[PDB]
């Protein structure tokens, strides 16, 4: 079917309330010094050492 009626920018902005992404969930590698993704290898120069 077709929308019976136009959508306000209040209804639209409400419905985009939960449309987002989250922070990548990252730790700090204790060899590279830099940041990394937990349970993944250090994308910088380094390894896993798990």
């Amino acid at each position: 079917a077709v929308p019976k009626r136009r959508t306000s920018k209040t209804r639209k902005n409400k419905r985009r309330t939960h449309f987002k992404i989250s922070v990548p969930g990252m730790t700090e590698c204790p060899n590279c010094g830099e940041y990394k993704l937990s349970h993944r290898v250090c994308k910088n120069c380094g390894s896993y050492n798990g």
Binding site: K20, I21, S22, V23, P24, M26, E34, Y35, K36, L37, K43
Partner: protein, 111 residues
């Protein structure tokens, strides 16, 4: 002081860039860099290059320390769209808007 850097007519829709600009607005500088490095989104490298540019103008253009800066502003405005077409069934043809965007980033040392 504040330093600023812009990237104009980036060829990505603005409401796809505003999704990842909202994760790094407010954070520190070295934290926002790692956030932009470790995210799946296609607009991550562009924002990363704009952020590194605004972090590099600070060291040289107006002398300041790059281990204190915080992302004071980060936003994306519209730019000129491109008008393409897609020929559908029964002779019709539908439009296609290729959106662009202008990414601005302002880094401040809080002073």
């Amino acid at each position: 002081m504040e330093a600023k850097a812009v990237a104009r007519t980036i060829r990505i829709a603005p409401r796809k860039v505003r999704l990842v600009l909202d994760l790094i607005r407010g954070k520190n500088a070295a934290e926002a860099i790692a956030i932009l490095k470790l995210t799946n989104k296609a607009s991550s490298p562009v924002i990363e290059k704009v952020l590194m540019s605004a972090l590099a103008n600070a060291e040289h253009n107006y002398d300041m320390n790059t281990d204190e800066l915080v992302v004071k502003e980060a936003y994306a405005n519209e730019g000129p769209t491109l008008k393409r077409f897609r020929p559908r069934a029964q002779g019709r043809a539908s439009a296609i808007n290729k959106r662009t965007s202008h990414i601005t980033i302002v880094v401040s040392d809080a002073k």
